[PDB]
């Protein structure tokens, strides 16, 4: 499913993402936008290390979810990567919360550093009623 901007913002708010571990909702929105364009079925194979990024938050199979085909894999969030390709994003949100519980925080996603960090991110939740 491809979320509409404000529809996603309200959904994330309801799922307790606003301010989770110091991360504002506008920041989670900026991340989802650049990672998948708000698309839950987005997948990306990293040929270089044989891992795959899954879903709206592009969660990696080497550390956060299990897909069986990733060498040297571990399961920190303990989910099946399949759960991250559903229309219902409850599991993707639970996984994203787990990722940021490590000291790296939101910086775990390189795309966040390149397109969100130190920028005006208000535009992502403006007019959404959150």
From Swiss-Prot:
Keywords recorded for this protein, A-Z: Amyloid, Amyloidosis, Antimicrobial, Bacteriolytic enzyme, Disease variant, Disulfide bond, Glycosidase, Hydrolase, Secreted, Signal
Coiled-coil regions listed in the entry: none
Domain C-type lysozyme, residue spans: 1-130
UniProt KW Secreted keyword: yes
GO MF entries: identical protein binding; lysozyme activity
Leftover remarks: Lysozyme C is capable of both hydrolysis and transglycosylation; it also shows a slight esterase activity. It acts rapidly on both peptide-substituted and unsubstituted peptidoglycan, and slowly on chitin oligosaccharides.
This protein's name: Lysozyme C
Gene from which the chain derives: LYZ
């Amino acid at each position: 499913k491809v979320f509409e901007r404000c529809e996603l913002a309200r959904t994330l708010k309801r799922l307790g993402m606003d301010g989770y571990r110091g991360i504002s909702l506008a920041n989670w929105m900026c991340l989802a936008k650049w990672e998948s364009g708000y698309n839950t079925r987005a997948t990306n194979y990293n040929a270089g290390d044989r891992s795959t990024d899954y879903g709206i938050f592009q969660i990696n199979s080497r550390y956060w979810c299990n897909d069986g085909k990733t060498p040297g894999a571990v399961n920190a969030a303990h989910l099946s990567c399949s759960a991250l390709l559903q229309d219902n994003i409850a599991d993707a949100v639970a996984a994203a919360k787990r990722v940021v519980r490590d000291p790296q925080g939101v910086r775990a996603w390189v795309a966040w550093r390149n397109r969100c960090q130190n920028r005006d991110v208000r535009q992502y939740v403006q007019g959404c009623g959150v």
